[PDB]
C-alpha cells in the first residue's frame, strides 16, 4: 500500500487515480467499508462517517483522472487505511 | 462424412453500437422548449411499433454496461445547452468564464424514442423480475424505445416507468455498498409543488411547498424496506453539494431545492427554495440562472423510484445522471444479426 | 423488427427453436409459398392524404424503404461474396472440409436437436477465422485440381 | 402497370403469345440487351420540383418504390424457396419426373406452339399440388442418392 | 421424352381481392363534402398512368360478380355518415339518435380505385363487351377512370357513356325481375331550378326540371331500337323507387318523370325532409329547404329499367348503380410459378 | 451499391481488381470489417420537406435501379451459360487474332478501360459465339 | 489454355446522353426571375455530394463536343422567354410578329447545377493544365455540377469560375483564326457599373462602369505572358464591328440591357461609356426585339471579371452564348457503365 | 313448400328467407311470373301487377334474413302459389 | 469552283450553305484566311479587314442552312477567291 505521513493535526490529500483522463464514478472508504467520500456523477457527496465533515475533494481534477480525498483537522484517531475505488483499481493507501 | 457446412439465415445476435436517433411528438409552434428542439434533432413518432416476441429466446441483459445511456446523455446535454442557457457559465481551465442573454423559456419534458438505424434493432426485456442483469426470459424486437421524458431529478427519480406489481430493487453490486441502488415503485407517488402568487416579498419570491400524501409515502417505504430486509436479514442525506442533499429538479425552467428530511427518517410538507446558482449536471461547473418569475407556479410530478444508497438503515444518494437514464434504458439493448453460420453436417459435396 | 431487414426477418421468428427446427420450418414454409396454399401478406407504410400527414407518412416512408432497399443489397452481396468457399448462390452448401472434435466433440444430432443456433455459434466463436481460412483454401484446391483434368 | 418490379413487364407481353413464343421473344431481347443493342427505358417517377406537387409526386413517388422494392424481394424469395425441387437461381428448371398423359394427353408441340401460358396453366390447374408434390419427393430422393 | 420443366415468369393472371387505395382531385379548402372528406381519405390520382394493352388477350369479365363495387360502397357509406349527416336517424326494437345539422354543399367528385403492391387492374376496352363473358380488348392499369358518387335512382346522372351505341346488360335479360342497365353513347342535359321567389308555405318545396323533349326522343328512339333486338309510369313503392331521386346542393330532391316515360318539358320536383335510408333499413330526417335560389345541371347517363313476366323506370338502388361504371375492371395478381412438360431431361 | 463497390477499382490493373475483389470479400464473410452508407436521412422538420425528400426519392430510384440491372443480367446471361454469376469461364477458345497477346500482358499491364477498347470491334462476333457454344451444350445433354 | 472468360462487374464508362435535369437554391417568395422559375423547373441542391476520385484514371473532356452545353441552352432559352418578356417580338417567316406586356422584375442570375438521373454519372476533369480538349490526369465522379450563374454577358465574362493558379487559354484550334479563344482568369477583377438617381434628362439612358487600372493591367500583362507560350515572337485591339451586342460589352443586371464601351480596357478607375437600350437583337435566335424604357431610380452591378474572350487574326469578341456556357460548364461529361467485359484465361469450362 | 290458408278479406303473410341475413336482394313471384314485390336494397318496391295495392313487407327483418310478403284484404282469386327469389333458393311458398 | 463575274458598283451575294437546316456556326475568309464575316449564334459580325465595310448577310436565311456574303459596290480589287466555313464543308468560290 501507499503510506502518507503527515503533522497529524493538519489537512492531508490522499489520491486516487484514472489513466482515462475522464471523470468516472469513484469512492473512497475506510478499513470497515465506512463510505467517505465519492461523486455523484459531477457532484461532490460526503460519507455518513466521522470524515463525513472535514472533507472535501477536487471536482476540477476529475476530468484530470485525479480522485483526491481531503481530510481537514486531521486527528490521530483518523490515521486509517483508505481503499479506492476507481475503475477497478482497488489500490490501498495508509494515513499517519 | 461430419463436416463443415455453410449455412445462412443463422439468427445469431451480437451486441453493436450505433448512432441511433431521436423521434418525438414535436409541435414546431408552441415555443416551448423541447417542441423547437426535437423539432429539428428528431423525427416523427414510430407510426406502427411491432413489439415482436422473439420465441423464449433467454438473452443476458446488463443496465449498466449499456451504451443507450451515453446517447441519451448527449443528446440531453446538447438539448440544456441550446434551450435553458445560463446568464454565467463557469468551467474549470484557473477558469473559463463566459456569459449569455436570457431570455426566460417554458420547460416541459416530452417523451422522447430512441430507433435503430437501418440493419439495427433494439431487443427489450419484458421481464417483471428483471433483476438488473444476467438473463431474461422474456425478449422482444422493436425499432423504438416507448419513449423517456428526459427529466432531470436527481435524488427521487419523477416521471418514469412502474415496475407494476413488485418493487423492483436494481444494483450492479447490492452489497458494496458503494453503488446507487435503483428503486422502481410499482405505483406513482403524487407530489403537488406551488409557489403562490403571494409570494412577492423580498429579504418571500424564493419559497416553494411540496405536499405529499402520507398514506402513500409510508406504504411506499414499507414495501421498499420490506424487501430490503430479504436481501439483508432510516435516514436522509450525508451531505454534500446542495442538489444531492435535497430534491432538486428544474419544472417551468426554476430550479427548485427541496428538503426531504421528513420523508426520509396527511399533507406532509417539505420546504423547497428557488435558486439562481446552480451546480451543473453536464458535467464540473457552474451557472447562475435569471431570477424568478412574477406570478404563480405549480408543478405536479409523479415519484416512480428512488436513488438509494447503503453503507457498510438506507439514505437517498442522488446526481449522477447516468444512472437516471439507466433507470428507464434498463430494458433496452441493441443488436445486430450476423446471418451466416458454419456447423457439422453428415454429407459430401458432389 | 422494422428497420432490421427482409430476409433476416423472415428467418429470425422462432430464433429460440433449434436448428434442426429452424430448418424444416423453412422447408415448410418454402412448399407452403412455392404451393398455393399460402398467401402473401404486405408490412408497408400507408403515404399521407392531407398536409397534417406529410411528415409523420413521409419520414418513416422512406426510412422503412431505406431499410428493405439496404437488406436487398446485403442478401445479394453475400450471396456472391460467398463464392470464396465456393457457395455462391446459396443458403444451404456442403464442402469437403472435415469437422474437427478439437472444435467440437459433439454428435450431429446432439448439435441439431438439443441446440439453438444462439447457443452453437457462441460455443464454436474462436474458430470462427480457422474454419473460414480452411473454407478458402479448400476451394482453391478444388478449382486446381478440376482445371488439371 | 403497377410497378410490379422490372420483372414482370416482358411478361405482360408474354401473356398475349404462345408458351414457345414467349420463351423464343425473351431470349431475343435478352440477347440485344446482353450485346448493348437495345437498352431498356427508366421508368422513375419524378420526384417534385415545386410545393403544388407535394403530396402527389410524393406520394407516387413511394408508391412505386415500395412496390418495386417489394417486386423484389418476392422475386428473390421466389429464386430461393425453389431450392425444393432443386430449382433455385433459375427461371427455367428441367426436373427427371415425367409427364404423365393423365395430366395432359397432348404433344409437345401441340402444347408449346398452339397454346399461350394463360390457357395451359388452367387446362392442368388441378394437377399442380400433385406434381409440385412429386418434384419435392424426387429431390430428396437425388439428394439420398447423391450423398452415398 | 415429355418431362416436368419448371418456369418462373409465367405470365399467368388470376382474380384476387385486395384492399384498394381511393384517389381524387380535392381541395381541401372550399369546405365541401366531398373535397374535405377526400381530403383525409384519398390521395392525389396516378400521375403517369401506364394504359398497356395486351394484344389480344381475352379475358371473362362479370360486372354482376365483381367485388370492386362492395369497395365503393363501403366508401361512400363512410362519405355519407360523416357529412350529410340526418337530425334524426332511426334504425334498427329500434333506436334513434339525433345529431346537429350545420349546413354543407354537396358536389360529388370523381374518385378513382388503386391497387398497391402488385394486383393490376384489368380493363375491358370493348365496346361489344354487354356486361358479361369473354372480352377480346384487354389493358391494364393502376388506377380505374374517375367515378363521381353519384347516388341518383331511375335516371342516372354524370356518368360515362357508351360513345357509340347504346348498350342494355342485365344478368338475366329474359327474366326481367333484375334491373337492365341502359348506358347511353349521348348524354341529355337536364336543368333543375327552384327560383327564389317561390317563398309561400302552408311554394318553398317546389321545382321544375327542363329537358329537351326533342333530344329526350331522340334517346327513347335509339333506346328501342336496340330493345327490339331482344317507357310507362313507375311501377309503385318508397318515393326513391317512384320519383327521381338525388340529392343536389345537399338538397334531396324527388321529380315525377311522367312527362318522359308515358320542347321545355318539364318535371314536377318536390324537395322533401324525410328521406329513407340506403344505408340499411331505416329513416331519416333532415334540415328544412335553404333560403335562396338553387340550380343543378346535369347529364342524363343512364336508365335502370325492369319489366314484368312496355318497361316501368322504377329502378336503382345504390351499390347497383355503380355496376354502371365498373362494369368493366377486375383485380388479378400474378403467380409467376407454371409448369409445362418440354423435350428435355434433367442431367 | 454494385457498382460503386467495383468502380474504386478503375485505374488499377484487371488483375489487381480482382485480387482486390477476393479480399474484401473475404474480410466481410469473415466479420473483420463494417461498413455504413451514404444515404439521406429523411427530415426531421417540416422546412427540410422538399430537400430531404426530393432527394430522398432519388437516391431510393437510383438503388432500385441498381439492384433490377443486376439481377436482369445474372439471369439475361443464362443465354450463355453464365447465369448466377460474376465470373464464367467457358468453352470458346481465344481467337488469337482478337488480340494476339499473352494473358499475363493482358491482366498485369492493362486496366479494364484499355482492353475493352482493344477488342472492341469483336464484341458482336465473340457473344455470338458464346450463345453457339451454349446451344451446343444443351444438346450434346440431352441427346445422352 | 486462353479460353474466353466473361466477367461482370467491369469498371468501364462510356460517353452517354441523358435528360439530365437542374438543381438549384430556388426561393419563390423574393419576385426575383429565377428565382419564381427555378421553383418549378429545378430541385434542391444535392445535400450530399460524393466527389469520388477514379484512382489514377486519365480522361478526355472536349468542352466543344460536349451536351451538356445543349441541355442548358435549352433551359435557359426557356427562362428567358419566360421571364424578360419584350413588348413586341419578332421572329422570321416575311415576318411573324407577336406582342406581350412589359412588367418589369428584376434579374440577378443565381447559380444552377446540373444533376445525374438514375443510372448515370458525371465524370469531371480536376486538374490544373487540360491542353483543352485533351486527356487530364485527375479524374472524379460525382452526381451534380458545380452551380454557373446564367450570365449572358458578351466580352468580358461576367461572375464565372476562376482558373485558381493561372490563366488557361483554350481553343479548338488556337491558330485558325476562327475559333474564339476563351480566356479563364484565375483572378476576379471587379467591374463598378452604375446607372445613377440623377439620370432625368432626354440622360436617362446614360450609364458608366470603374475598373482598377492596377488590376487590369496585371490581368492582361499575365494574359500575354500565356499567349507568349503559343505565339513566342509576336507582339488588345478595337473590335471590327457587327450587331452592338458584340462591339460593345452588353450584359443583362437589374433586368436592365447595358452596352459598354470597352476601347480604354483593350488598346485608378478607367471609365467604360455605357447605354442603356430599348432595341435589342436576341441572342436566343435571329430575330429582335423591343423593351421597355430604363428604370427611373439607380441600379448598380458591381460585376466580377471571371474570363473573356478573344478573337486573332487578340481582340476582344463574343455572342453564341452556348460558348460561354462551355467555359463555365468546363470539364464535365456524362457516363454509363457497362458492366460485361471478356478476357482471355487460363480456365476452361468443363 | 310453406303452405297457408286464408279467407276472403284478411291479411296473410308469406315468407323467403336467407341465410346470411346481409339483405339479400330478393323478388316475389306469382305462378305466372308476374312481379309482386321485390327490394332495391333498403328500399321496398311494387310490381306493376293487381297485386302492387295492398302489399307490404316487414322490412325491418331484412337486414335478419327475413324478406315477407303481405298481402292485405285478400281475394279469392289471390290464393296463387309463390316464388321466392332469394340467392339461388327459388323456394316455393302457396296460399291457399 | 463558283466563279462569279460582277461589274464594279454592283452587290455581290455569295453563298455557303448547310443540308442541315441547323443553327450553325459559319466564317468567310479570303485567300489570306482573313476574316471578312461571319457569326456568332443569332450575332452577325464583321471581319477586321478591308471588307469590314461594304458587306452584309441575310441572318433571317440561317436557319434554312444559307449563309451569304453580300459584298457591296463591288471593285475589281474585291475579285479575290473566299473560303466558306460551314461544319466541314470547306467550299470555294470566287469573284472576278
Ligand atoms: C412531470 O409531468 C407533469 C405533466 O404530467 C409536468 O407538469 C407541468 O409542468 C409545467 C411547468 O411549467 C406546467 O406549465 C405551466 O402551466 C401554466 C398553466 O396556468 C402556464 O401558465 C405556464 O406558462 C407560464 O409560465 C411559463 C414559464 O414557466 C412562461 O413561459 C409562459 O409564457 C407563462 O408565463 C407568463 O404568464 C404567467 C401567468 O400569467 C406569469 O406568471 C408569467 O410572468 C408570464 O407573464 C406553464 O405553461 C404544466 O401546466 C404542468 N402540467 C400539468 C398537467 O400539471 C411536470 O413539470 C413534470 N415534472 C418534472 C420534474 O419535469
Ligand atoms: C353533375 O355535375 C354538375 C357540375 O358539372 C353539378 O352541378 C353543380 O351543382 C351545385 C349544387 O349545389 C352548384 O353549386 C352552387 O353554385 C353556386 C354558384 O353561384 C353557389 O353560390 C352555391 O353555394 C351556395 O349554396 C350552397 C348550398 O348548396 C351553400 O353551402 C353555399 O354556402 C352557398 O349558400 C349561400 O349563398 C346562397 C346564394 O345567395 C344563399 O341562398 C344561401 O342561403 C347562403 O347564404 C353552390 O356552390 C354548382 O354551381 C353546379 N355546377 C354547374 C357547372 O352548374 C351537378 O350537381 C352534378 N349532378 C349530381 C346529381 O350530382
Ligand atoms: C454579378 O453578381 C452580383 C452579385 O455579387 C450582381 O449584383 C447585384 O445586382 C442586383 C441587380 O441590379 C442588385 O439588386 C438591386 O439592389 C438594389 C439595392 O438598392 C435594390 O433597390 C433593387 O431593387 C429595386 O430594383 C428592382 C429592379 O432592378 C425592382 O424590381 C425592385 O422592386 C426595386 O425597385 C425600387 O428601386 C428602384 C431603384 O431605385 C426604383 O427604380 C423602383 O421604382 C423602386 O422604387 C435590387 O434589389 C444587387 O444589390 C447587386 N448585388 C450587389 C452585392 O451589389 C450582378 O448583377 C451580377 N452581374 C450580372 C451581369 O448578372
Ligand atoms: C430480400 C429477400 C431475399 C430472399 C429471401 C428468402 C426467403 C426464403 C428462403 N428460403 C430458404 O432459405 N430455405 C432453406 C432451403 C430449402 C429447404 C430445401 O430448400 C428451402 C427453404 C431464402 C431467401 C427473403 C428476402
Ligand atoms: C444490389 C446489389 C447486388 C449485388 C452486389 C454485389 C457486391 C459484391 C460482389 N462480389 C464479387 O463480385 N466478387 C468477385 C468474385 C469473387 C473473387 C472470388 O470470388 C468474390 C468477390 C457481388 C455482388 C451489390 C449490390
Ligand atoms: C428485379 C428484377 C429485374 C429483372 C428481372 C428479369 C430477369 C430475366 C429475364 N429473362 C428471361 O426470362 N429469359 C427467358 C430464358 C432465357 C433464354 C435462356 O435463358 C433468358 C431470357 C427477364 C426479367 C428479374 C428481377
Ligand atoms: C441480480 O443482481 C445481483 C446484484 O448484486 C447480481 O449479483 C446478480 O448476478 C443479478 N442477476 C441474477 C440473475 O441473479
Redesign the interface.
Known sequence: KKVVLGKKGDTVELTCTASQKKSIQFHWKNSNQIKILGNQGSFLTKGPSKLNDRADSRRSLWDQGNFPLIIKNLKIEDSDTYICEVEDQKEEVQLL | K????????????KEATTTLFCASDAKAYDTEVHNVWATHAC??????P?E?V?????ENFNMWKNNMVEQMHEDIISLWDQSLKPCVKLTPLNTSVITQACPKVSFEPIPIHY????????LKCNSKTFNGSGPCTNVS???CTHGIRPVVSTQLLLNGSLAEEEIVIRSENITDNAKTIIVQLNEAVEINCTRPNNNTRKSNIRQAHCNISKARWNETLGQIVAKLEEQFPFNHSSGGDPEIVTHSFNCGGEFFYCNTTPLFNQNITLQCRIKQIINMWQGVGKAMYAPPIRGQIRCSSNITGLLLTRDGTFRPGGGNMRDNWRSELYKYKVVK?????????????R | ????????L????????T?GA?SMA??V???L????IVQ?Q?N??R?????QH??????????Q??????????????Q????????????????????NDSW?NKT?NE??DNM???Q???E?DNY??H??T???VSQIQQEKNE?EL
Open positions: 461430419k463436416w463443415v457446412t455453410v449455412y445462412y439465415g443463422v439468427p445469431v445476435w423525427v416523427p413518432t414510430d407510426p406502427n411491432q415482436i422473439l420465441g423464449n429466446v433467454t430507433c435503430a438505424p437501418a440493419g439495427f434493432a433494439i424486437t422493436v425499432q444479426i450476423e446471418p451466416l453460420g458454419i456447423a457439422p453436417t453428415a454429407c459430401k459435396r | 423488427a422494422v428497420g432490421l431487414g427482409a430476409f433476416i423472415g428467418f429470425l421468428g422462432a430464433a429460440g427453436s436448428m429452424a423453412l422447408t414454409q418454402a412448399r409459398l412455392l404451393s398455393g402473401q404486405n408497408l407504410l403515404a399521407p392524404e392531407a398536409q406529410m411528415l409523420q407518412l413521409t419520414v418513416w416512408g422512406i426510412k424503404l431505406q431499410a428493405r432497399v439496404l437488406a436487398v443489397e446485403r442478401y445479394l452481396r453475400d456472391q461474396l460467398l463464392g470464396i468457399w465456393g457457395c455462391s448462390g446459396k443458403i444451404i452448401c456442403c464442402t469437403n472440409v472435415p469437422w467440437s450431429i448439435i441439431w439453438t443456433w444462439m452453437w455459434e457462441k464454436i470462427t477465422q474454419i473460414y480452411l473454407l478458402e482445371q
